[PDB]
Amino acid sequence: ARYLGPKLKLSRREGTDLFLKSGVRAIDTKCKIEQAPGQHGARKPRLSDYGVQLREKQKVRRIYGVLERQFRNYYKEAARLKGNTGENLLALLEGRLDNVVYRMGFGATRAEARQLVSHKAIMVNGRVVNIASYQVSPNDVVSIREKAKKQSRVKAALELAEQREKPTWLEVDAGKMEGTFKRKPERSDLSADINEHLIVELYSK
Amino acid sequence: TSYIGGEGHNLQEHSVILIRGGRVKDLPGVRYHTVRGALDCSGVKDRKQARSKYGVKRPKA
Amino acid sequence: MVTIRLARHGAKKRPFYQVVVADSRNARNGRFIERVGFFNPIASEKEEGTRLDLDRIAHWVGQGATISDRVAALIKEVNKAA
Amino acid sequence: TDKIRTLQGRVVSDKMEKSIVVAIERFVKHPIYGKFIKRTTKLHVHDENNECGIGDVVEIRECRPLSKTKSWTLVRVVEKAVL
Amino acid sequence: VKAARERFGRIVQMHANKREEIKEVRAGDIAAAIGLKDVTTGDTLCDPDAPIILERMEFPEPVISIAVEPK
Amino acid sequence: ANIKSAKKRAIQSEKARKHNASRRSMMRTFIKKVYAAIEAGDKAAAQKAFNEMQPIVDRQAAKGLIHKNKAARHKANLTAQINKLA
RNA sequence: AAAUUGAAGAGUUUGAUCAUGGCUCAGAUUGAACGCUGGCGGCAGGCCUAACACAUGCAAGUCGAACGGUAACAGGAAGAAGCUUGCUUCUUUGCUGACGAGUGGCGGACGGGUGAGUAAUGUCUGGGAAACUGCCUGAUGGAGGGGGAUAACUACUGGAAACGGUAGCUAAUACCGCAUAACGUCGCAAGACCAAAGAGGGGGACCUUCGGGCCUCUUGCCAUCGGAUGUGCCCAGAUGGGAUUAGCUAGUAGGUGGGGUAACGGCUCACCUAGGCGACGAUCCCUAGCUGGUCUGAGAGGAUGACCAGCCACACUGGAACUGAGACACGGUCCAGACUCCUACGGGAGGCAGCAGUGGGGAAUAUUGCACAAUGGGCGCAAGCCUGAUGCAGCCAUGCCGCGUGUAUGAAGAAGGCCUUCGGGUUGUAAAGUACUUUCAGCGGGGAGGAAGGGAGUAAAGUUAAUACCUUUGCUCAUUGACGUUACCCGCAGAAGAAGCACCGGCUAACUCCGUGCCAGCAGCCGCGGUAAUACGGAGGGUGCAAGCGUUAAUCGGAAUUACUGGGCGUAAAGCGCACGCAGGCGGUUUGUUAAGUCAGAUGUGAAAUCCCCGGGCUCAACCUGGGAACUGCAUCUGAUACUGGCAAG
Lengths: 205, 61, 82, 83, 71, 86
What we know:
The structure is cut from a larger assembly and holds chains A, B, C, D, E and F. Chain B is mainly beta. Chain B is built from no helices and 3 strands. Chain B has a 3-stranded mixed beta sheet with strand order 1-3-2, with no helix packed on it. Chain B is globular and about 40 Å long. By secondary structure, chain D is an all-beta fold. Chain D has one domain (3-82). In chain D, a hairpin with a 5-residue loop joins strand 1 (6-13) and strand 2. Chain F has one domain. Chain F is 80% helix and 0% strand. The radius of gyration of chain F is 18 Å and the shape is elongated. Chain A binds one RNA strand through helix 1, helix 2, helix 3, helix 6 and strand 2. The PDB classes it as ribosome. Keywords: 70S ribosome, elongation factor G, EF-G. Activation of GTP Hydrolysis in mRNA-tRNA Translocation by Elongation Factor G.
């Protein structure tokens, strides 16, 4: 599906930050970002230990926005593959092209990215790609459809990407609309406030 | 012996229902329920959030 | 008695053919005696759409086997005697 | 030698001639529990001559069916129950 | 009249109450379709951008009642 | 609903049965003559019967009416028996 | 080069506790059904119940390059007629393409479906010798010459029919005799013994009624003998449940000799003779296709056995055999049986546990589809025909997965909704406005792969009776799509064409107002409801998951609660009332030895794919696929002799 309706709201349940709605004035300003949502958001949480875990598997599910049936599969992969599960899972999740074009800064929120991959404005290795989740292999060309080097969603996100982004494990070029995806994560290459060991704990029984 | 969930009366003094396993333990003998939205014995009249069990079609618009 | 004939495998209009020494009087992906090659009629933007074992074929023919109308045409396709 | 069916066995009956009854004690470990335990496989062997008696140890070998169940023939008597 | 997607499984023409074979039905013919079990009298069956309902609907109501029970 | 095209196979096999059965009998009366010739006890008349059998069986063998190793078994068993009743 | 960290717990007994112990819960799985809802594509699956009857059509033919032949159709064609002026039309001609039927040849015993029977008289694993086997292939050897019959046809003659019948004639590569007759066949050997067919394409010379002998190649056919592949058989070991099933068995157990199968065998039989099987569970009865494998699970284990694939049993129900290389026959026969159909009223027909579909069953499961094109089966010298196998498409959110349902901006925090200590929060940047963009869908254009092949042609390797025919390497030219207007690609509109379902007392993430007052009503468990209900009914708010969601059914786990890995027995369930002792379980201590277990090694085996692993391709993934490795086992040989068992002496 594509999980929509009230977007910073979902994040306010998650109850810290999140990398959403990042064009303009949102980050405590015209949105309340702390408290908690709804009519019983003013008082403090009941919580539950099952809660803290499930809510952090949700967090990370929401910062990348995938569904459980995909995430169940990324857990399968981290187990299935020979490397440490919680770290490897972040890696396995990250290698998705739709976050990569976002990591390129060709959008400045993922949904911007996800739309232009899907609505077929991205090309990987010079080959037409719209599979959003796609495995970008370590050391691949990222390129954007000629026609798309001009959308207000493109230009604005390029300046948003400007002096914002350029990570360890991809390298990027703005005039040429190009990026070199260097590799997948080991431990070091990705995070935020996220829990990885709590989810493997959760998915394992 | 089947229990019959929901309000809006039983129906069918002498006709056909589909039944399903399941206890409600405070009665004697109940092992079964009738599916009110299936075959006859009409889906339970009114209601607005508890609809799937004891069928209520999407309440119109 | 047997044949060297193609067996079909894979999926809806991307079949893979897998090449087989098999009993004459059984399904074309029934039972079989030795598996002797691979054939892909989908060669599209890829190599290795034909791989086959000459030594086995020769074994089978000197004992007594018919190679099929398409399998004789895989010979035509392997082109290592021209 | 090199692949033939030749076995050793205990003789547990002689009572009609030309039949002879040879019981084989085999070990196997019981397939779930361990414990190497016995089952005794009991076989028809062609006698020809009353060379065998009871409590004896014999050698028997495959020789293709001669009568129902009865396909083994007697080779040699190791030990004769010293009667 | 329902607004539903149909197939005419095969069509047969009636001679006596025995079944004569044709393989299609054109304008101005009467016939039967074989199976096609849902429809009720006064339904209209039309082309893919259908005349939706034709006028027809009208027939009489039941004068006298009895109660039935099986044996 | 009808029989596919089995008919012509269907009829032939009865003609063939009768044909076999005749030569099968032809030999049979002879096989019986051989043992009754063993009982008559004579080497000479009974080997004369065997000598009559040796042409009779072999064409049954060749033409597929007893075939296989079937001929051979009949040929041999009886042939020796004549010698055990010299 | 792949084994490799899948070995959670929670609530419930009491005033309260530790224990003991049953129940319930969160996980994964499905050939699923149902309710509520529902966009696309891909892929995969779709009667588990009645193996219950089946309407209708279709699921097995083919050779005229076997043969007699010549209804059909078609063409060429002799002669006429009409005359058109040499064309239309007739007759007759197998002349030729061509072939209905028939004789005859090979394939209907393969493919497909079904799981009733059956506890393996088939199966799984290895090991066996007594065996058969059409094509196919390897080798030798042969194919000489003749006789009669009979279909059809044709006459006759019965039958409202189905299907005949009475009579005469004609062939073969059908039949039959004859020749010859092994490296064969039977057998001491002597000796006996049986075989076949031509036909076609062509002919470069000859014979000649160029009919046809013949010349030349292809090909067919026959004897032996191996091959290969299949099939018959055997032995041991593994395989569901009951002993509130304990004695079963004389063709049974064995032999002797005759008999018989393609072959050893009471397989069968007459003589014999007295066994065989059984608590290491015979027998009896219940249930049950098997297996690879699937599911589940750490593993061990448990569950499970049309999803695919090997195997096996079955064919309206029951018996028996035929024919054949192959069967006791899935669309054959024969008989009996139950049930159904024609009608002629005398007598005859038929089998959807093939494909589609009907009715009946049931919670529940499809299209009376497209096509021989690809693949493969069949017959064919090949063209060709034949293919409800087989490809697809059809129909079901039935599963699995991909992908969409605009995206960003955007209040000073708008109506409406809801609570409100009436302060104000919330619903919510949600909404409106803004800018950008259009997967899919819808709509216009372009369009990969599946196509390999065969036909006919020159030449030529080459038989080369020269340059024929054949034959093949290539070469020669025209030329192969069921799906299908398919993917795929380009273009054109627009924020548009499109999101549900369940849950919120604890277990279990999430929460309040108001409607009812033991009710109405919820319950997987604990329980709640008897005036302010976090359960009940709805509103707001909230959480979870999504083209689904929930729920009841089903397997395993959680469960160490049937425990080998891994439990217990004073009192919680739990030691026989006590003892002797048979079978079985178990064996102090030594030397030697043997070599069964034992362990190491080697070699054969464990089908395919599946599982697992490393690649690869379809825009990824689902999927599909190359090789690796597993393939927890058996086999036989060699070896190691401590341990144990055997065995001899302490």
